[PDB]
C-alpha cells in the first residue's frame with residue numbers, strides 16, 4: 514500500500530465558490546488599480562489578470578499540507594505515519610484566509626493555521642530558503658491561479674517570498690485601500706491584499722489521489 518499524491522484540507526463546494534469568487538474580484542480590482550497599471554512591466558515586458566491566471570484549480574480548492582507523491586517525495590512516509598495525521602484524516606476544519614496575493618507567476622490566498630492545524634504541517638529536512646526566519650506553516654496557502662508556464666507549487670514559494678518582503682513591515686506601507694482590505698505593493702510584480710476581516714472556510718483533511 515502507498516500514500517496519497519498529497520495531504521491537505523479540501524474546501525466544501527460552498528466555501529470553494531466563496532473563496533474562488535473572492536479571488537476573481539481581487540484580480541479584477543487589482544488589474545484596474547492605478548498603482549498596478551504603473552508597474553505593468555512585470556507582467557508585460559490594460560491587462561485582465563483573470564486571463565493572465567488562466568490555469569486555475571478546475572474543481573474544489575484545497576490547502577496542501579504535505580506533498581507525498583505516493584511516497585516518492587522526501588519526508589512523505591515520515592509525515593503520514595504521524596498519529597495526528599491518522600487521527601485528523603477525514604475530520605473537518607476551519608481555515609482562516611488572511612490575505613490574497615499575486616505575482617507575475619501565481620495568484621492565491623494566504624492561510625493562517627490554528628495550533629491544531631499547525632500540528633498537521635510537515636517538518637521536512639529540505640526547506641525553501643524563503644521559509645527562513647518565518648514561523649512554521651507560513652507557506653500555508655490556497656492556489657487560485659497560475660501563469661501559463663508556471664507550476665502551482667510556485668504559489669507557496671510566492672507566498673513565502675511575499676512574507677519576507679513584509680517581515681518587519683507596517684500598514685503605513687499600504688499603497689491604498691481596496692473594498693475588503695489594504696493593498697500592498699512589495700515591488701517586482703508582488704501585490705498583497707490584507708483582508709480587513711479574515712475569511713473562514715470549512716474544509717476536510719484527507720488525501721488526494723491523482
Ligand SMILES: Nc1ncnc2c1ncn2[C@@H]1O[C@H](CO)[C@@H](O)[C@H]1OP(=O)(O)S
Pocket residue numbers: 519575576577579580655656665666667668669
Ligand atoms: N513539490 C510540491 N510541494 C507541495 N505541493 C505540491 C508539490 N507539487 C505539487 N503540489 C501540489 O499538489 C497539486 C498536484 O500536483 C498541485 O496542485 C499543488 O497543489 P497546491 O498546494 O494547490 S500549490
Ligand SMILES: Nc1ncnc2c1ncn2[C@@H]1O[C@H](CO)[C@@H](O)[C@H]1OP(=O)(O)S
Pocket residue numbers: 554700701
Ligand atoms: N518605469 C520602469 N520601467 C522599467 N524598469 C524600471 C522602471 N522604474 C524603475 N525600474 C527599475 O529599473 C531597473 C531596470 O528595469 C529595474 O531595477 C527596475 O526595477 P524593478 O525590477 O521593477 S524593482
